[PDB]
Scaffold this active site. Structure first.
Site, mmCIF file in Angstrom:
data_model
loop_
_atom_site.group_PDB
_atom_site.id
_atom_site.type_symbol
_atom_site.label_atom_id
_atom_site.label_comp_id
_atom_site.label_asym_id
_atom_site.label_seq_id
_atom_site.Cartn_x
_atom_site.Cartn_y
_atom_site.Cartn_z
ATOM 1 N N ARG A 196 -4.022 -9.987 4.108
ATOM 2 C CA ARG A 196 -4.302 -9.911 2.437
ATOM 3 C C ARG A 196 -3.240 -9.565 1.984
ATOM 4 O O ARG A 196 -2.955 -8.324 1.845
ATOM 5 C CB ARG A 196 -5.737 -9.048 2.271
ATOM 6 C CG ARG A 196 -5.965 -8.939 0.735
ATOM 7 C CD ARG A 196 -7.442 -8.104 0.846
ATOM 8 N NE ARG A 196 -7.724 -7.974 -0.697
ATOM 9 C CZ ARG A 196 -7.241 -7.262 -1.522
ATOM 10 N NH1 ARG A 196 -6.142 -6.350 -1.213
ATOM 11 N NH2 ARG A 196 -7.589 -7.189 -2.799
ATOM 12 N N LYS A 220 0.818 -1.182 0.091
ATOM 13 C CA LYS A 220 -0.042 0.149 0.098
ATOM 14 C C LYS A 220 0.976 1.131 0.133
ATOM 15 O O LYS A 220 2.075 1.419 0.353
ATOM 16 C CB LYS A 220 -0.841 0.037 0.975
ATOM 17 C CG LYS A 220 -2.211 -1.151 1.239
ATOM 18 C CD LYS A 220 -3.251 -0.186 0.737
ATOM 19 C CE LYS A 220 -4.498 -1.420 0.675
ATOM 20 N NZ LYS A 220 -5.181 -1.859 1.826
HETATM 21 N N1 LIG Z 1 -11.185 -6.734 2.625
HETATM 22 C C1 LIG Z 1 -10.390 -5.872 1.881
HETATM 23 N N2 LIG Z 1 -10.762 -5.806 0.683
HETATM 24 C C2 LIG Z 1 -9.616 -5.254 -0.050
HETATM 25 N N3 LIG Z 1 -10.141 -5.041 -1.499
HETATM 26 N N4 LIG Z 1 -9.442 -4.213 -2.424
HETATM 27 C C3 LIG Z 1 -8.194 -3.683 -2.143
HETATM 28 C C4 LIG Z 1 -7.618 -2.840 -3.043
HETATM 29 C C5 LIG Z 1 -6.459 -3.589 -3.833
HETATM 30 C C6 LIG Z 1 -5.231 -3.616 -3.327
HETATM 31 O O1 LIG Z 1 -4.464 -2.426 -3.631
HETATM 32 O O2 LIG Z 1 -4.656 -4.374 -2.448
HETATM 33 C C7 LIG Z 1 -7.937 -3.589 -0.513
HETATM 34 O O3 LIG Z 1 -6.843 -3.015 -0.235
HETATM 35 C C8 LIG Z 1 -8.696 -4.349 0.346
HETATM 36 C C9 LIG Z 1 -8.414 -4.638 1.727
HETATM 37 O O4 LIG Z 1 -7.546 -4.024 2.123
HETATM 38 N N5 LIG Z 1 -9.334 -5.491 2.334
#
Ligand SMILES: Nc1nc2[nH]nc(CCC(=O)O)c(=O)c2c(=O)[nH]1
Ligand SMILES: Nc1nc2[nH]nc(CCC(=O)O)c(=O)c2c(=O)[nH]1
Lengths: 259, 259
Positions: free
Chosen positions: B239, B205
């Site tokens: 994630r 990020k």
């Molecule tokens: N639960 C969750 N879903 C996401 N979807 N998409 C994104 C954006 C995609 C990416 O930049 O990783 C995200 O950061 C998150 C997150 O931090 N947490």
């Protein structure tokens, strides 16, 4: 928060702005001094300096002196960074400070050779006291480490070592079983009660392999984990092989905790 | 300690043995379905599975369905692992569970499309509620996140979502300035008071770049740091993009904390 600076002759290390990274520095047909040895050592010191290190750690009594002195002379001449001498021997420590080393680094916490504390007191250098013992027979692991470290402090202080020149080390990977190494890691904050800066040496150590089931060259993420948890438990120094990687990890931690 | 298991149809995720790694999965001339798209997606799912992932995260309303459905059909057929659908749209979520997705993943915490909570309730799937808002105007950052997340829970629960199918996400890198992202990281344990498992998404990020001054491909050690601190503050899921590296880091953490 530390109300003083770690004073190492020409250089001064602030203990509040960031986690200080101590880099671990790397010949047959020779008793010491060669062009291959000391040059390879200087290239490494130079590299570590370039990738984030704040301190360089350089580490048969006659042999030890004739090996390590030429390396200290060269590196302190050519790399603008405080040097620590990784020995438990009084005579070797004297030599190394004479040859230019700034900090003593004793893996026996002044118990192997008490006279080393007297060396430290004399040259007025910072001394790292690491936890060690000749057995793994603990009543209560943490309570005993703290007991044992305290005895190291007593020897240092009796010798005239000032409080500000004392740094502690839990001695991870020493006199501790794989499960006991993890226990100390889990309970590292307890060392803070003693009032001294703490250095953490876990880089590439055997217990990371035990957990991850990975050989020495594959222990980078594992090392990182131990560094991150250590900084979070209030470590002032980390002693690592992978200076580039750990510096970044240390830096991101510091931002998050607010150091 | 969790007295229940995260139930995802055919697969079941225990929340006590280890930190669960959710892997983030990766075409012009096409509206969806191609041999290049779905094959590249399957190769990636397969790889992530091989290197430690426990969940695969797959993420113009007409388009979204015709893109994402074919990918879910293939990956759930060919990779033995629970799949989550990264959408905030009610209709897309329905489609994806029909096509085989096990977990919903809503970056607007049921606020963009409340009917999504009704979708979740219906198929009896676990739903991730992430913190988000259209502004950065906080009275008290943590107190407001918790306030906002709570409103997400109210929408989910009113819709018939069971407590056990609710997972929370601080939404790092959303509606938060670089300094506010670090503050949430520093205070992540506060989310535990709500009584729900927490997922942490910080991989590569922008705020890691702000701290380290490093571009997206150079944020591996920085990511590691955020993962380590997150696990230490009691995260159940992370994630990440770099499944191999984070798995090892997660594993070594777990050993140290005693998970
Ligand atoms: N639960 C969750 N879903 C996401 N979807 N998409 C994104 C954006 C995609 C990416 O930049 O990783 C995200 O950061 C998150 C997150 O931090 N947490
Ligand atoms: N202070 C301190 N000195 C050391 N010297 N040598 C060693 C052994 C060398 C190595 O395996 O890293 C060590 O682990 C430590 C340590 O952990 N801490």
């Amino acid at each position: 928060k530390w109300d003083y600076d770690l004073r190492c002759g020409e250089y001064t290390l602030n203990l509040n702005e960031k986690t200080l990274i101590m880099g671990i520095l790397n010949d047959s047909f020779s008793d010491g001094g060669s062009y291959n040895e000391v040059d390879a050592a200087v290239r490494h010191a130079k590299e570590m300096r370039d990738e984030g290190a704040h301190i360089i750690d350089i580490g048969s009594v006659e042999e030890e002196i004739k090996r390590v002195v030429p390396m200290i002379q060269a590196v302190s001449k050519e790399v603008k960074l405080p040097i620590s001498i990784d020995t438990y021997k009084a005579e070797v420590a004297k030599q190394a400070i004479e040859a230019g080393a700034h900090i003593i680094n004793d893996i026996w916490g002044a118990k192997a050779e008490p006279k080393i504390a007297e060396v430290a007191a004399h040259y007025d250098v910072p001394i790292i006291l690491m936890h060690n013992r000749d057995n793994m027979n603990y009543r209560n692991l943490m309570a005993d480490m703290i007991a044992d470290l305290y005895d190291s402090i007593k020897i240092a202080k009796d010798a005239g070592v000032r409080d500000e020149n004392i740094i502690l080390d839990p001695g991870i990977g020493f006199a501790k079983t794989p499960e006991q190494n993890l226990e100390a890691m889990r309970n590292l904050e307890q060392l803070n009660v003693l009032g001294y800066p703490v250095l953490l040496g876990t880089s590439r150590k055997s217990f990371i392999g035990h957990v991850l089931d990975l050989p020495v060259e594959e222990r980078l993420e594992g090392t990182g984990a131990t560094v991150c948890l250590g900084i979070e438990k209030g470590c002032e120094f980390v002693r690592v092989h992978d200076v580039k990687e750990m510096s970044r990890m240390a830096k991101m931690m510091d931002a998050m905790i607010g150091k």
